[PDB]
Amino acid sequence: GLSDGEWQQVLNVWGKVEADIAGHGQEVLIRLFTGHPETLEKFDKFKHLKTEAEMKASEDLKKHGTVVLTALGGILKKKAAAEAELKPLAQSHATKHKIPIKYLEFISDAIIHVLHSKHPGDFGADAQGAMTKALELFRNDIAAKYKELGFQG
Amino acid sequence: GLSDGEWQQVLNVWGKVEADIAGHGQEVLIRLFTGHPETLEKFDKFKHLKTEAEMKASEDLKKHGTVVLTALGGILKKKAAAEAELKPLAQSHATKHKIPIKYLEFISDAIIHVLHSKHPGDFGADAQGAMTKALELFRNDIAAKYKELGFQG
Ligand code: HEM
Ligand code: HEM
C-alpha cells in the first residue's frame, strides 16, 4: 500500500498531467509503441504507423492518448479516495484499539441482522447477499492493511 | 467483488440506515455486545455498561453507533465508486481487446518515463515510487477482475 503522503503525491502529479493531457497522452503512447512495438498490433488504427514522426502527426493517436490518461486519472483519484476512508480506520483499529478481524466479522453479522430485521421488505435475499459480500471485501481490505502495520489476527 | 447491481443494492439500503442512523447504530452495538461480550471488553470506555437498559440509556454508546455507521457509509460509498471506475476497463480489456498484464506493465513504465521526462525537477524518487506503487495496485486490481471474467492475463 501507499502512505497518505504517497497518495497525495500521485494526485499532485496527475494535476500536472491534466494540465497538458494531449501532450502527455501522445508521449505515453509513443513511448509504449517505440519501446514495445509488439503492443502496436492491438490497435487497428495505429499499427500502420512506423515512425515516431508519423505517431506525433496522428490526430487519432493523440485523441486515444487523452482517452487513456483520462480514464486512468479517474481510476487513480477514486482509488485514492477509497484508501483515504479505509486507511485511518485500519490505522486506529490495528494500532490503538487492537481489533481482530474476527470482531469486524461479528459487527458485520450484527449490521446484516439489524438491516434484515428493520427492513425486511427492502433487504431480501439478493440485497442481503450483496451486503454480505460488501462487508467481506471491507474486512479483506482492512486485513491487508493490518498486515502492513504489524497486526496479524 | 460485487457487480454494479450489487453495489446499488448496498447503497440503496444504506440510504435507509442514514435516514434513522442513531437507532441503527444503537441496535447494531447492542446486538454485537450482547452476542459477543468479548467485543464489549474492547471498549474500555463502555465498561460501566452491564445490562441492555444501561446500554440503551447511554449517551455515548448512541453517539458511537452513529460514528461507526457514518464511517462505514463513507467506506462503502467510496469503495463502490472506485470499483465502478475500474470494472468497465477491466471488462473491455479482458473480453474484447485481450490485453495481457505484461502490456499493462509496459504502459505503466511508459507513464513513469514520460512523467520523469516532463517534470524532471518535480517527479523525484519518492514521487516516482508512489506512482510506481499506485500503478502496480492498478494492475493487480485489473488482474483480479480478469480472473473473475475467466481471462488469463
Ligand atoms: C493505463 C492503462 C490503460 C487504460 C487506462 C486504458 C484505457 C482505455 C480506454 C478508456 C479505452 C476506450 C474504451 C474501452 O474500450 O475500454 C481503451 C481502448 C483500447 N485499449 Fe486501452 N487502456 C490501457 C492500456 C491498454 C494497453 C496496454 C493496450 C494494448 C497494448 C490497450 C488496448 C486498447 C485497445 C486495442 C483499445 C480499443 C481502441 C480502439 O479501437 O479505438 N489498452 N483503453
Ligand atoms: C464496521 C466496523 C467499524 C467501523 C466502521 C468502526 C469505526 C470507528 C470509528 C469511526 C471510530 C472513531 C475514530 C477511530 O478511532 O478510528 C472508532 C473507534 C473505536 N472502535 Fe471501531 N469501528 C468498527 C468496528 C469495531 C469493532 C468491532 C470494535 C471492537 C470490538 C471496535 C472498537 C473501537 C474502539 C474501542 C474505539 C475507540 C472508542 C473510544 O474509546 O472512544 N471498532 N471505530
Curated annotation (Swiss-Prot), chains A, B:
Entry annotated with the keyword RNA-binding: no
Modified residues (Phosphoserine): S3
Binding of heme b, residues: H93
Globin domain location: 1-147
Description of how the protein assembles with itself and partners: Monomeric.
Summary of the function given for this chain in its UniProt record: Monomeric heme protein which primary function is to store oxygen and facilitate its diffusion within muscle tissues. Reversibly binds oxygen through a pentacoordinated heme iron and enables its timely and efficient release as needed during periods of heightened demand. Depending on the oxidative conditions of tissues and cells, and in addition to its ability to bind oxygen, it also has a nitrite reductase activity whereby it regulates the production of bioactive nitric oxide.
Binding annotation for nitrite: H64
Localization, UniProt: Cytoplasm, Sarcoplasm
SUPFAM superfamilies: Globin-like (SSF46458)
Biological-process GO terms, alphabetical: oxygen transport; removal of superoxide radicals
EC number: 1.7.-.-, 1.11.1.-
Keywords in alphabetical order: Cytoplasm, Heme, Iron, Metal-binding, Muscle protein, Oxidoreductase, Oxygen transport, Phosphoprotein, Transport
Family: Belongs to the globin family.
Origin species: Equus caballus
GO cellular component: sarcoplasm
Any one GO MF annotation of this record: metal ion binding
EC main group: oxidoreductase
Residues engaged in binding O2: H64
InterPro entries: Globin, Globin-like_sf, Myoglobin
Main location: cytoplasm
Leader peptide range in chain numbering: none
Reaction catalysis annotation: Fe(III)-heme b-[protein] + nitric oxide + H2O = Fe(II)-heme b-[protein] + nitrite + 2 H(+); H2O2 + AH2 = A + 2 H2O
The protein's name: Myoglobin
